């Protein structure tokens, strides 16, 4: 139930002449590959991005993908030629192909296609098919593309066989990076809340890995209920940032502490009290002309 391998493709078609395709690959939440319109070859982003695969095993895939890219571009352009009143430029296609990893190689595979931001077509079993809620005009292009059994045989190999085989290789080749532990660093803050005579207390938490984290404002053991957890925000160095905020009246701040629990911290939870020796000092290094 652990990991999910994703090959994310994004294609833009503005006019007949102008088009581009950019692709990124994610294992868990770590980027493994990068490939852009200008780059003829797929670039590695980790020292273990090739996995267990040979130089030739890899070159088979890269050549098969290079051939696919230019084939995909021209095939979309011809589909717009075919679909004249029904669909027209500009076109945005998003492909999400990969395989979810489990114990004992359960390795579920998926190939999901979005069109103009909406999920429409799924490869399944042996063939393409439109999902519930798809535009009706897609029925014909799917038939046209399903007539190619050669493409189908290649995709079925990629999903059923080549996907799980490749990613297991990555799961070992990059075992160190996947299982690494990075410690969160917390610092307190506050802004005036919308209501007059109220303060919004902010607890920043930055630089932690893996992604599971526990952040709650507290007054002793009693957990403070009005704590609002933010959305996980990515740092450039493959680490995570999160802020948790509590809202209170002015003067009610004393006694409060931002508690943070993380896997990297061992048993030692970061308990950071509001008016601490360190908060006083760290706050003085922050002052500015609001």
């Amino acid at each position: 139930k652990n990991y999910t391998f994703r090959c994310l493709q994004m294609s833009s078609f503005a006019n007949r002449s102008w088009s581009r395709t950019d692709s990124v690959v994610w294992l868990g939440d770590l980027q493994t590959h990068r490939w852009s319109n200008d780059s003829a070859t797929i670039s590695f982003t980790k020292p273990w991005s090739q996995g267990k695969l040979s130089n030739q095993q890899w070159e088979k895939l890269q050549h098969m993908f290079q051939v696919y890219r230019v084939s995909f571009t021209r095939d979309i352009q011809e589909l717009v030629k075919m679909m004249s009143p029904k669909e027209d430029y500009p076109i945005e296609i998003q492909l999400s192909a990969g395989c979810e990893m489990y114990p004992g190689n359960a390795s579920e595979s998926f190939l999901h296609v979005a069109f103009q931001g909406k999920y429409v077509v799924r490869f399944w079993g042996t063939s393409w098919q439109t999902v519930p809620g798809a535009p009706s005009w897609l029925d014909l292009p799917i038939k046209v593309l399903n007539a190619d059994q050669g493409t189908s045989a290649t995709v079925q190999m990629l999903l059923n066989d080549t996907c799980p085989l490749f990613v297991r290789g990555l799961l070992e080749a990059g075992k160190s990076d996947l299982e690494k532990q990075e410690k969160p660093v917390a610092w307190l803050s506050s802004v005036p809340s919308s209501a007059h005579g109220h303060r919004q207390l902010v607890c920043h938490v930055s630089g932690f890995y893996p992604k599971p984290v526990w952040v709650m404002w507290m007054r002793g053991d009693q957990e403070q209920q009005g704590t609002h957890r933010g959305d996980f925000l990515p740092n450039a160095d493959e680490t995570w940032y999160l802020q948790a905020t509590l809202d209170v009246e002015a003067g009610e701040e004393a006694g409060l502490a931002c508690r943070v629990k993380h896997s990297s911290l061992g048993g030692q939870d970061i308990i950071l009290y509001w008016g601490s020796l360190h908060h006083i000092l760290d706050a003085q290094k922050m002052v500015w002309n609001h």
Partner: T-cell receptor
């Protein structure tokens, strides 16, 4: 079941004269093509269609235009005939659900006379 | 070009066997097919080859496709006078109606009685 026919079989034209070639077809084919066979050269695509209405440019699209009136009918136009132009034009129809199923007409031989 | 046929002109005795060659560069290479064209006539389909290494025979016409070598061969068994035509080798680059055909220059076969 059916035949892909193109009329006329032979065409007598003049320099600068606007020329038209027609192509009727019985199969329920959506895709239709126009080729020109140059002596000692392979066929080159001029215009093709998916129905309507549809006229997509090929590789020898310059000098010609084309129009598709019906599913059956597909017409090619020669804007201005080169003075000494002697060429064969070929019409082909194809299936949209089977790329292998392609049928060709008997051809059209042109002589531009002055 | 992208599809070469060799030789340009071939001559065989009436009754013999004749061999026609076709090399290509086109990618991808979904299928390869052969056409017979008489003088002042259209193109007639003889054989369609689909597989990696494929063999198809239709009447006296027979063909072998080698996708790895990007090479194909047409055989005519017991050559007749009626086979004094042009033979065209065409390759389709996709397995759907979206693909385009690539036409070889052709080979004139002349049959000596």
């Amino acid at each position: 079941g059916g035949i892909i026919t193109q009329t006329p079989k032979f065409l007598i034209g003049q320099e600068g004269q606007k020329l038209t070639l027609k192509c009727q077809q019985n199969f329920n084919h959506d895709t239709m093509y126009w080729y020109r066979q140059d002596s000692g050269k392979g066929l080159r695509l001029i215009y093709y269609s998916y129905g309507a209405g549809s006229t997509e440019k090929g590789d020898l699209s310059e000098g010609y235009d084309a129009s598709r009136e019906k599913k059956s009918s597909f017409s090619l136009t020669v804007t201005s005939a080169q003075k000494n132009e002697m060429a064969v034009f070929l019409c082909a129809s194809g299936s949209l659900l089977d790329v292998r199923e392609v049928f060709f007409g008997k051809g059209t031989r042109l002589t531009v006379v002055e | 070009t992208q599809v070469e046929q060799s030789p340009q002109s071939l001559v065989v005795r009436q009754g013999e066997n004749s061999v026609l060659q076709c090399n290509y560069s086109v990618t991808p290479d979904n299928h390869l097919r052969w056409f017979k064209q008489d003088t002042g006539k259209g193109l007639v389909s003889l054989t369609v080859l689909v597989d990696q290494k494929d063999k198809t025979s239709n009447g006296r016409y027979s063909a072998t496709l080698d996708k790895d070598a990007k090479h194909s061969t047409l055989h005519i068994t017991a050559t007749l006078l009626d086979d004094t035509a042009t033979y065209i080798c065409v390759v389709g680059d996709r397995g759907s109606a979206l693909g385009r055909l690539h036409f070889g220059a052709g080979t004139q076969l002349i049959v000596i009685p």
